[PDB]
Scaffold this active site. Structure first.
Site, PDB file in Angstrom:
ATOM      1  N   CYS A   1       0.782  -1.229   0.000  1.00 31.35           N
ATOM      2  CA  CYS A   1       0.000   0.000   0.000  1.00 31.35           C
ATOM      3  C   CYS A   1       0.819   1.288   0.000  1.00 31.35           C
ATOM      4  O   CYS A   1       0.511   2.222  -0.744  1.00 31.35           O
ATOM      5  CB  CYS A   1      -0.969  -0.025   1.190  1.00 31.35           C
TER       6      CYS A   1
ATOM      7  N   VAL B   1      -3.818  -8.534   0.953  1.00 24.50           N
ATOM      8  CA  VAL B   1      -4.088  -7.181   1.442  1.00 24.50           C
ATOM      9  C   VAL B   1      -3.041  -6.806   2.466  1.00 24.50           C
ATOM     10  O   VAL B   1      -2.639  -7.622   3.303  1.00 24.50           O
ATOM     11  CB  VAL B   1      -5.478  -7.002   2.096  1.00 24.50           C
ATOM     12  N   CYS B   2      -2.580  -5.567   2.358  1.00 26.21           N
ATOM     13  CA  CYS B   2      -1.741  -4.969   3.379  1.00 26.21           C
ATOM     14  C   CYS B   2      -2.640  -4.879   4.626  1.00 26.21           C
ATOM     15  O   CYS B   2      -3.739  -4.303   4.580  1.00 26.21           O
ATOM     16  CB  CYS B   2      -1.157  -3.615   2.914  1.00 26.21           C
ATOM     17  N   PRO B   3      -2.201  -5.514   5.727  1.00 30.23           N
ATOM     18  CA  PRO B   3      -3.050  -5.787   6.890  1.00 30.23           C
ATOM     19  C   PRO B   3      -3.322  -4.549   7.707  1.00 30.23           C
ATOM     20  O   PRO B   3      -3.752  -4.648   8.856  1.00 30.23           O
ATOM     21  CB  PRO B   3      -2.208  -6.760   7.712  1.00 30.23           C
ATOM     22  N   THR B   4      -3.076  -3.398   7.103  1.00 33.13           N
ATOM     23  CA  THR B   4      -3.251  -2.105   7.749  1.00 33.13           C
ATOM     24  C   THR B   4      -4.399  -2.016   8.786  1.00 33.13           C
ATOM     25  O   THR B   4      -4.240  -1.358   9.808  1.00 33.13           O
ATOM     26  CB  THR B   4      -3.315  -0.983   6.684  1.00 33.13           C
TER      27      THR B   4
END
Lengths: 106, 184, 185, 99
Positions: A68, B49-52
């Protein structure tokens, strides 16, 4: 996918071609920092993972779900390519990230 | 949602959880009785997914701490998976050290007991439950896989339930109408 | 939550409702197919609570409009009660002119359908459901009675489902990796 | 219904309520000018399991702040007798075993 190209080739893949379907939530200071690192030490930034999916009518579709902050840095630097690993994948793998928003890939 | 009914006690559970320290520990939702618990599901451990989302609840655990609250996360993946995910540095696509326990629910029953299992996949929707110090379910949120939860909105809810909780230690005002209470 | 499941169509309802203009209409969730719907329950009509929520939703109706979404409010009261509450001005406690429709759930089957009924006092909990243009259900939020809902949070949610939606209208990329394309060493 | 001069300190306001400060300031304004154009609030009168006198307030959200932003000891209010089920509608699992 008739083929496969394993187990770790790195490609310069155009940002204009990446579908980034998930709402980013970004720590700006981390974005601002990664920018400094890509400018000045690009090799120390590991490539992102890109899902490559075949459409019903054979279309190439490329999804990016991770890195991201890397992605955003690259968008800030206005590069047209980002280092990526291509991971061949199915439709049903999408629905895991997309749920009822999963499109019908032509 | 499943058994979970607002205003009624929270569907208890007992599973092996990866704690902040690195070690396994079979635990139960009772053990936190006396604290507000925010309990949240997430689909899978080695997401692309980036686990943000989880990193966000872990990062801000002190905010929850300051409210006599305990954030616990959960998925269907094994407790060994959890370990390994915490032991993969964020940048290498992982969790890194985590400040909040993670429940494992390989039987998919805790997911089911909360009504947040999607049959097709055998995994949890991004569901989140706020339970009180007296073990009562106070609010339910469930999200289709694509969209995440706000830490800010979870805090805002927690505080609000605490606000009204904190009245009701109140007692007769020693006041009575009237007159000379009546107004011209 | 009732027969409302994520990934599955919304539990349809038909009921009679008061519309932004005042007149009763007799509507169903299906009329709204093709738009996002934000469907929310409140406890009941003449709450001695100053109705912070409904008013706030009625007040930022435009913002929902430009996200191609319709906000609808429900409560187990009669539509007579809704009509009555609308004409009561906001100074002496009332709702005032709404910009959003108000559904009436007298038989209380919608609350059950949506798994939000308080069995004992027979009212709805503070529920809110987001349903998409295809009538699918995307998100469930239910709160115990004392805690209101946030308009910003609802917007953030609608915007995020729509973000994800819109990104599924994509055309074959016309591009492939190849030896031409490798990043060496 | 008789309008009562109830002390602000008697009122239990257990609801977390975020207020528009502009609304409040407009009310403070109007009050000092024309206090009788500002209608009285409603106050839930509840008797607990014993003698117990409790007076809640849930409405006049912006009206309360207006009165407490000023110095005021009392606020004009209408009194409403109520059950505990009445109360349960407002407080849910946060309803007290009033005495």
């Amino acid at each position: 996918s008739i083929h496969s190209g394993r187990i770790a080739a790195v490609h310069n893949v155009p940002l204009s071609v990446l579908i980034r379907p998930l709402p980013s939530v970004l720590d700006p200071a981390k974005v601002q920092s990664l920018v400094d690192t890509i400018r000045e030490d690009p090799d120390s930034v590991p490539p992102i993972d890109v899902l490559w999916i075949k459409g019903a009518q054979g279309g190439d579709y490329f999804y990016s779900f991770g890195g991201c902050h890397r992605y955003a840095a690259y968008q800030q630097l206005q590069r047209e390519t980002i280092p990526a690993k291509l991971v061949q994948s199915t439709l049903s793998d999408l629905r895991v990230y997309l749920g009822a928003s999963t499109p019908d890939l032509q | 949602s499943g058994n979970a009914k607002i205003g009624h006690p929270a569907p208890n559970f007992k599973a092996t959880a990866v704690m902040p320290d690195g070690q396994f520990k079979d635990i139960s939702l009772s053990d936190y009785k006396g604290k507000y618990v925010v309990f949240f599901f997430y689909p899978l451990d080695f997401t692309f997914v980036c686990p943000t989302e989880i990193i966000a609840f872990s990062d801000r655990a002190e905010e929850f701490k300051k409210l006599n609250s305990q954030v616990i996360g959960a998925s269907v993946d094994s407790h060994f998976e959890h370990l390994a995910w915490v032991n993969t540095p964020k940048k290498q696509g992982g969790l890194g050290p985590m400040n909040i326990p993670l429940v494992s629910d390989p039987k998919r029953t805790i997911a089911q007991d909360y009504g947040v299992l999607k049959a097709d996949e055998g995994i949890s929707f991004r569901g989140l439950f706020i339970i009180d110090d007296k073990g009562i379910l106070r609010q339910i949120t469930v999200n289709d896989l694509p969209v995440g939860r706000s830490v800010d909105e979870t805090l805002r809810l927690v505080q609000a339930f605490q606000f009204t909780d904190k009245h009701g230690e109140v007692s007769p005002a020693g006041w009575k109408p009237g007159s000379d209470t009546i107004k011209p």
